């Protein structure tokens, strides 16, 4: 109940959180960089022009 | 009757008392610490709100 260092529940949550947070943040950041580039933005505009 | 150091009755009571007192005090103290934490208190309030 107190939450000892060696307790399985306390340790598991901490280990899982660190790995999960890093992976989620990295994936989102990588995707954003591609979007940031001007050429990608231009393609979207071209696509809009292309469909009509 | 006087209660010698080597007498079984005198020795047994003293040995039993020291072990028993320490165990009882420690268990009660550990329980109290969990109660002391704010989150536990909040849960009780939430439970009261939840049942109604």
Curated annotation (Swiss-Prot), chains A, B:
Q: Where is the protein found, in the record's own terms?
A: Cell inner membrane
Please quote what the entry notes about the protein's domains.
A helical hairpin is formed by residues 25-137 which is conserved in all known ESCRT-III proteins. Helix 5N-5C (residues 193-217) contacts the helical hairpin 3 subunits away and is essential for oligomerization. The C-terminal flexible linker and alpha-helix 6 (residues 220-256) are not required for oligomerization and do not resolve in electron microscopy.
Q: Subunit structure, per the record?
A: Polymerizes to form rings, filaments and ribbons. Rings are formed by stacked rungs that tilt to give a dome-shaped curvature. Rings form with symmetries ranging from C11 (55 subunits) to C17 (119 subunits).
* Its job: A membrane remodeling protein capable of forming rings and/or filaments on membranes, which then curve and tubulate the bilayer. Rings will form on liposomes, altering their positive curvature so the lipid bilayer is remodeled into a negative curve as the membrane enters the ring. Ring stacks of varying lengths can be seen joining isolated liposomes. A lipid monolayer can be drawn into the center of the rings. Required for thylakoid formation.
Regarding protein family, the annotation reads: Belongs to the PspA/Vipp/IM30 family.
* Name of protein: Membrane-associated protein Vipp1
Give the species this sequence originates from: Nostoc punctiforme (strain ATCC 29133 / PCC 73102)
What residues of the intact protein does this structure contain?
A: 156 to 207 of 258
């Amino acid at each position: 109940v107190r939450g000892m260092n060696t307790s399985s529940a306390m340790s598991a949550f901490e280990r899982m959180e660190e790995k999960v947070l890093m992976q989620e943040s990295r994936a989102q950041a990588l995707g954003e960089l591609a979007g940031a580039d001007l050429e990608t933005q231009f393609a979207q505009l071209e696509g809009g022009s292309d469909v009509d």
